[PDB]
Design a protein around this ligand. Sequence first.
Ligand code: HEM
Ligand code: HEM
Ligand SMILES: Cc1cc(N)nc(CCc2cncc(CCc3cc(C)cc(N)n3)c2)c1
Ligand SMILES: Cc1cc(N)nc(CCc2cncc(CCc3cc(C)cc(N)n3)c2)c1
Ligand SMILES: C[C@H](O)[C@H](O)[C@H]1CNc2nc(N)[nH]c(=O)c2N1
Ligand SMILES: C[C@H](O)[C@H](O)[C@H]1CNc2nc(N)[nH]c(=O)c2N1
Ligand SMILES: [Zn+2]
Lengths: 402, 404
Amino acid sequence: KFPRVKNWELGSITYDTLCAQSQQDGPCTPRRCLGSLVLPPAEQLLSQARDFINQYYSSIKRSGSQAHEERLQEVEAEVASTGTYHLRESELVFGAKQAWRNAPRCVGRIQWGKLQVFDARDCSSAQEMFTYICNHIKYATNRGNLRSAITVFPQRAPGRGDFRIWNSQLVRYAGYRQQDGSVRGDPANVEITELCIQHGWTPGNGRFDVLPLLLQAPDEAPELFVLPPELVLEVPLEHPTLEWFAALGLRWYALPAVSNMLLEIGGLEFSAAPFSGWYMSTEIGTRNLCDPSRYNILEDVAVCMDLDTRTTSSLWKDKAAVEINLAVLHSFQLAKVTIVDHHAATVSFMKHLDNEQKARGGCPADWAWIVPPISGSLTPVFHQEMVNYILSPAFRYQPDPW
Amino acid sequence: GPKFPRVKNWELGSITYDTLCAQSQQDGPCTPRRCLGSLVLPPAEQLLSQARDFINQYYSSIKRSGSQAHEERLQEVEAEVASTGTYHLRESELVFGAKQAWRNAPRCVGRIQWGKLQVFDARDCSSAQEMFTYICNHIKYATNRGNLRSAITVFPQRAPGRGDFRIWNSQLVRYAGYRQQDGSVRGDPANVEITELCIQHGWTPGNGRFDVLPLLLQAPDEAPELFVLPPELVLEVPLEHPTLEWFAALGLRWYALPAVSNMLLEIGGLEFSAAPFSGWYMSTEIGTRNLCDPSRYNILEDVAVCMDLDTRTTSSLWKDKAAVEINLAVLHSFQLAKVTIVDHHAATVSFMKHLDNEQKARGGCPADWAWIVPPISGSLTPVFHQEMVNYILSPAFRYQPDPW
Ligand code: HEM
Ligand code: HEM
Ligand SMILES: Cc1cc(N)nc(CCc2cncc(CCc3cc(C)cc(N)n3)c2)c1
Ligand SMILES: Cc1cc(N)nc(CCc2cncc(CCc3cc(C)cc(N)n3)c2)c1
Ligand SMILES: C[C@H](O)[C@H](O)[C@H]1CNc2nc(N)[nH]c(=O)c2N1
Ligand SMILES: C[C@H](O)[C@H](O)[C@H]1CNc2nc(N)[nH]c(=O)c2N1
Ligand SMILES: [Zn+2]
């Protein structure tokens, strides 16, 4: 019934009672488990809405109370006649905060408290959209002292199409299908960089060409928006001892800002709702820089480091992975830019567990994404049992708009 | 699309559908509401169908399926059970049965080698001295002077009321963990309880950091004898780092043979309460879990000191560097001792082959991602980008209670 979740490094044993709050079901069944997998009426909305409203006022003192009284009524009315309602600004600030907290893949959750919710539900043109982006980005970068934030664009309509950001991050490097099967720059970004060309933009042949923004208002042809260079803040990557590293001319950006997700709240749905925290050095070091399907620079730096590619058993792959990571870490502390090493980050998540285990008795987590891509067993999380289940409001993946 | 689960490989873009799981006549702990994939652990009428099952499988391996040899051996197992509530496997199907459970084990990257497991029936066994000798033979054979061969030895099954056979020791080789009375431990803290249980039995403990535990062996009911192992028979490997000189000075060593001994092999309903299996090590096992887990031997702290590293802060990345070096140290010393070993990249590359095989053969391979993917260099290995499906199949290894 209620699950025993033990930490193995410390013999400590808890129970998750928070699961029962999950409405939405996942992939696992009694027969076989699919934890590893990356992805997947009228009156019914009134119930999601409802259950979100109880959540809300229990959040503030006013639980099951006296404005919780008639507020549950404005909704009664507004779906009753028009089959969809709108959120009060305070209520939306709650939904964002909550939905991050609710996301079992996010190791940066200790922070869910502090978050800046820009409101754009008054956005009509894609022009206005752009402005909001630059402003989200300005507030969020904060000259290098990064601040977690989420601009929220209009909630999709029963009738019409959607506001959608086509980009899968506000900042990104172009990916350029050369002529020889070859790829120049970020390969995870080819199919997309093609769409900007297709919607008529001047490309480069740069490794770290920052891409422009393709924003789309409902039932309208996507518009392109070249992003004022000054907002995108990037870091050259050097190395505390290897003199030769910055020869390589590797750079990364500061702001990780997801844009292709779907903010689901109180039953309503936000197709654009970009959000941006701050990076964990391994995202930049290990995946971003080393994934084969990406920039894939492991071998390069390994040869530099005069190591031995010839065989796997010389650990050359692990040896480089650690410098590159170590390089990524340095760089930010050099350039006065917020960064979080895996160790430091997982330690605090550990905290967040307990911390929530208190507040709400449990907390959903996707172990495989919670544990770092290098040196896993060397973080605590690796030794902590986790329980993963779906909790509204939360972020949800959505099919690309083309 | 198919009525089965889609399995993508995010590095190569490839897909396959796992249809083996259709045959999981056993339940796991994940349910549509919540997933418990991370949790380390979560006979009258039935005993028939379980064998009914296993036999079908047998007669498939031989591809003499549906035939009269089939139905005759089917009409024989009932004969026997129907009359006595139990049956015995022919020796040929024990050999099959054993390999199938290994092949089935969702947590073993080793499985590329599944068909090369070499089985010693010891179902004739009856005392405990007997147990110890059979076991020696095993080690003897399987160590094979460092050029190591996978092997299992099977001891007589469970019964209606009649003491199980049981090996108390978890592996056939695990170093003593002596609790100092200053709070700490000396040696492997994994094995405290067992080291305790051995002095409590008349072994006189040593006082080093790497003393090989004596072997605790139970026969049916007769409360368990305590046997020691011939020092020449337990191939140890002392550890040096190839470039860094002072490592050998750390006094670290490891044993060659990883011999799981406390598990249960289950086939056709029948339960084999003591039936240990050995393979060979994968660098990380030793060089990350064993030597570095804070719960364990925990050397990371000292090694970084020796590496002149800044341990005051984590942004220095000392854990990772020290770990990499310790592993490089594990691989070098086995390599140089001419003692079978396998690096993590090389272990996974090969799991990925096994998956491509098992797809052709059974249509699916069950796996614990959290357990398949190595404890360092996670993503650096192909498996990491491999969606997997976990599920229970029989024959199977089960975890079992500590006997006390
Ligand atoms: C502030 C410090 C933060 C840290 C250290 C952090 C770190 C991370 C990391 C490392 C991941 C895994 C990414 C991956 O495996 O590729 C992640 C996932 C995620 N985080 Fe954060 N993040 C932070 C801020 C935020 C914020 C502010 C939000 C919400 C607005 C957020 C929401 C998410 C979501 C929704 C995912 C999973 C998304 C997906 O699977 O696409 N994170 N976080
Ligand atoms: C060929 C050399 C082998 C290698 C390199 C290898 C590797 C591994 C590894 C790394 C684990 C996970 C250990 C952990 O993380 O705690 C494992 C688990 C396991 N292995 Fe192997 N293995 C090998 C041979 C075998 C053999 C010969 C058997 C039995 C015939 C076997 C059966 C199992 C089983 C049943 C488990 C899971 C049981 C449990 O949950 O503890 N493996 N193997
Ligand atoms: C293309 C794609 C497909 C897919 N199925 N999932 C994803 C999400 C995984 C993913 C990939 N790149 C980047 C991220 C960013 C995660 C992230 C988000 C925030 C807010 C902060 C931070 N440090 N990190 C996440 C991306
Ligand atoms: C509570 C618990 C449950 C469980 N299923 N396994 C364990 C033990 C985990 C464990 C620890 N050290 C060692 C092993 C066996 C590793 C192992 C076994 C074999 C046969 C080959 C090889 N290379 N490696 C397993 C504990
Ligand atoms: C196949 C596997 O589920 C997939 O590659 C996951 C594994 N672990 C991960 N871990 C983190 N931290 N981030 C990820 O994107 C992933 N991806
Ligand atoms: C909490 C976590 O599941 C636990 O530490 C698991 C994680 N992955 C593992 N993976 C392997 N191969 N072996 C283990 O013992 C563990 N331990
Ligand atoms: Zn599951």
